[PDB]
Design a binder for this molecule. Sequence first.
Ligand SMILES: O=C(O)c1cccc(C(=O)O)n1
Ligand SMILES: O=C(O)c1cccc(C(=O)O)n1
Ligand SMILES: O=C(O)c1cccc(C(=O)O)n1
Ligand SMILES: [Eu+2]
Ligand SMILES: [Eu+2]
Ligand SMILES: [Eu+2]
Length: 190
Amino acid sequence: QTIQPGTGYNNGYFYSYWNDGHGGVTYTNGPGGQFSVNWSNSGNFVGGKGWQPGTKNKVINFSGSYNPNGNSYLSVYGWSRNPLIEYYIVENFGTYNPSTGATKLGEVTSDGSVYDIYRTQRVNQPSIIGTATFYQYWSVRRNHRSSGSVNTANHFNAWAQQGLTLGTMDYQIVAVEGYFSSGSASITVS
Ligand SMILES: O=C(O)c1cccc(C(=O)O)n1
Ligand SMILES: O=C(O)c1cccc(C(=O)O)n1
Ligand SMILES: O=C(O)c1cccc(C(=O)O)n1
Ligand SMILES: [Eu+2]
Ligand SMILES: [Eu+2]
Ligand SMILES: [Eu+2]
């Protein structure tokens, strides 16, 4: 249904929808692993469906439509604890490459494309454990797509070869994220 921000379970899948207070985002849970998001002149938000907790060898499928108009990502998206890490395997994005300004560490080939790997740092920012300083890990897919399958282990293994280690997993979703933009998406996870 159309829901306000929160987390929970819907039709067998964990979901998370967070919105920074700017309005303009309509997040809807659908049947099965489906969710949709339609946004207009948003702030920053993140929404999607998956698992709580994720795993270090899940193969994640996604399909549907993704039509951002500006700064937006479509990603496998999640966290670990001890260490505290927010990670992204970015399958598609809008006008802003999330790695802009970041230092590249390497490349991994998976599911039909090369990805570029990066590490960034969030300082005193919101997190799954409250205000915190933590690293973010990125794999950015060169061949943008809105449906496919992601072998998460390929990314976690490449990241580890760059000294980027993960802790105990927290949630693991396919997320649409927007940052002060407009768009539509309708995505089914499995
Ligand atoms: O009344 C509201 O502000 C409302 C209602 C449904 C969704 C949302 C939202 O996603 O912010 N907000
Ligand atoms: O309950 C709500 O309506 C809500 C909560 C957080 C952010 C937003 C929003 O950005 O409208 N709305
Ligand atoms: O206070 C709110 O959450 C609010 C106010 C205006 C629009 C919206 C919305 O788009 O959710 N939300
Ligand atoms: Eu609202
Ligand atoms: Eu080649
Ligand atoms: Eu908060």
